């Protein structure tokens, strides 16, 4: 899984201007029955 | 309300288009 993730949405008119930061979350994938499926990014240790 | 945040439509998005405010970012 990679898309059961709240995607950050923040103000596309002003997001081209500056870095707004994460102010709202767009839903990534839905279902009638809620399941918090884990995503690999957690399971892969970071480059730095 | 649609305050400039979100999608033009959820049709081709393949999502629901559900937008909720980040409780983390306040101050």
């Amino acid at each position: 899984s990679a898309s059961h993730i709240l995607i950050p949405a923040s103000d596309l008119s002003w997001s081209k201007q500056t870095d707004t930061g994460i102010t709202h979350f767009r839903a990534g994938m839905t279902h009638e029955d809620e399941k918090l499926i884990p995503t690999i990014f957690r399971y892969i240790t970071t480059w730095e | 309300s649609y305050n400039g945040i979100g999608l033009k439509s959820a049709k081709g998005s393949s999502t629901s288009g559900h937008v909720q405010r980040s409780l983390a970012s306040n101050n």
């Binding site: 884990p38 | 909720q20 983390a24």
Partner: protein
């Protein structure tokens, strides 16, 4: 005579029991005052218990304590109807006397009592309305406002039809007739409380249930001669579980925080999902533990758990206390279990929050560097702590924060040169020795 003697101090002590109970009568003491009052003979001191209520009402120090007093009267009238029977009588006569005396101070003291007694179903609405008819027959308008502000909430519920007719004649006063000024703004204030629906005249001690109070709604009127029974207050002469050894509630909750943690991409995303849960304040110490333990499963520090914890702290102060309680709980207790690969995660973790002021420098005052009160793994945790302090801030900015920290744990100055020799030896082993220039000046003076 010893029987006239023994009945007199019996009459004295009953008089000397009720009067300190009434003076100690307040809210959250009402049931305790009524319990001790019940064991003293109420029926023999029938006018004693009534007169100690009337005078404590009348004294003008009270007026505040009237709803505590009238709630005791309902407790008596539920227990003995005759007590609330006679006490409803005297307050009728106390009004009719002082209304004829035009004692406006003493009238309002009685009318606040008669209002809250009507709030507690002690007296009928007939005895209330006829007082209103006598007051509205004259002006008497300072008195009738304090009545209807308090009792009109209940009174419109019970007897709305005549109570509309009281309002309609009372409205005819302001609009078609001239009034004195200071009285006038108080009368229209009653019309202002009317549209606010009497929500500021409807607070009292409803201790009795409507079926626990035996309904002795005494239907006396203020046009009856009420026998004025003062005489019984004188002295006379009687010739008469499965134990919970498992924590499966916690394990399911511990699973849910871990699933939240692993389902997110960014640190702000998981911070959103935890704050969405609205976790109760008893568990918010435990949620911090689940974050930190799962930060040790990662086998490497991640900036995820920092920016997770930073959005917790800036949200609400009870999160900020929960990390401050956890940082003490980790250092004083949990260091003995943690391997050295987990200490480099935690020392980089807590060093991130301290260097960006999410935790203050004053939390570092708990940590003390001695030979006795230090763990060998505790010295490892401090070493990985200060490197993240050095790397983020720099060596000079760290020097300023440690000088404003005024701590004694890392920095012994007052004496005990074996600890000063210890602390210089430990910091130079880390690689930071520029900050130890204070101690070397202190050490050679001791030599």
């Amino acid at each position: 005579d010893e029987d006239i003697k023994f009945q007199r101090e019996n009459w004295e002590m009953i008089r000397s029991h009720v009067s300190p109970i009434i003076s100690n009568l307040t809210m959250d003491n009402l049931q305790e005052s009524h319990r001790d009052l019940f064991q003293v003979n109420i029926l023999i001191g029938r006018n004693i218990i009534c007169k100690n209520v009337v005078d404590f009402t009348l004294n003008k120090q009270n007026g505040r304590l009237i709803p505590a007093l009238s709630a005791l009267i309902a407790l008596l009238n539920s227990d003995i109807p005759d007590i609330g029977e006679t006490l409803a009588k005297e307050l009728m006569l106390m009004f009719v006397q002082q209304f004829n005396r035009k004692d406006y101070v003493s009238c309002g003291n009685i009318l606040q009592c008669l209002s809250i007694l009507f709030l507690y179903d002690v007296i009928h609405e007939i005895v209330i309305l006829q007082i209103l008819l006598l007051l509205l027959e004259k002006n008497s308008l300072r008195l009738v406002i304090a009545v209807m502000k308090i009792c009109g909430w209940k009174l419109a519920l019970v007897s709305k039809k005549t109570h509309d007719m009281i309002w309609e004649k009372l409205r005819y006063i302001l609009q078609t007739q001239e009034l004195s000024s200071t009285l006038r703004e108080s009368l229209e204030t009653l019309f202002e409380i009317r549209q606010k629906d009497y929500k500021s005249g409807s607070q009292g001690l409803f201790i009795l249930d409507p079926t626990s109070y035996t309904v002795h709604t005494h239907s006396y009127i203020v046009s009856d001669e009420d026998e004025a029974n003062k005489e019984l207050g004188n002295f006379e002469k009687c010739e008469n579980q499965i134990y919970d050894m498992t924590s499966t509630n916690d394990v399911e909750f511990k699973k849910k925080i871990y699933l939240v943690l692993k389902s997110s991409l960014s640190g702000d995303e998981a911070a959103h999902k935890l704050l969405k849960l609205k976790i109760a304040n008893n568990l918010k110490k435990s949620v911090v533990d689940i974050i930190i333990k799962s930060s040790l499963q990662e086998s490497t520090f991640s900036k995820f758990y920092s920016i997770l914890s930073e959005r917790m702290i800036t949200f609400h102060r009870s999160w900020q206390t929960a990390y401050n309680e956890t940082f003490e709980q980790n250092y004083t207790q949990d260091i003995e279990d943690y391997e050295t690969d987990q200490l480099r995660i935690l020392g980089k973790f807590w060093g991130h929050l301290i260097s960006y002021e999410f935790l203050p420098m004053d939390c570092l005052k708990i940590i003390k560097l001695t030979e006795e009160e230090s763990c060998p793994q505790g010295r490892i945790f401090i070493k990985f702590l200060f490197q993240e302090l050095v790397n983020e801030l720099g060596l000079d900015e760290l020097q300023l924060r440690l000088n404003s920290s005024k701590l004694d744990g890392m920095f012994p100055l007052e004496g005990d040169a074996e600890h000063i020799r210890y602390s210089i030896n430990f910091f130079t082993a880390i690689g930071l020795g520029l900050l130890t220039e204070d101690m070397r000046s202190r050490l050679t003076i001791i030599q």
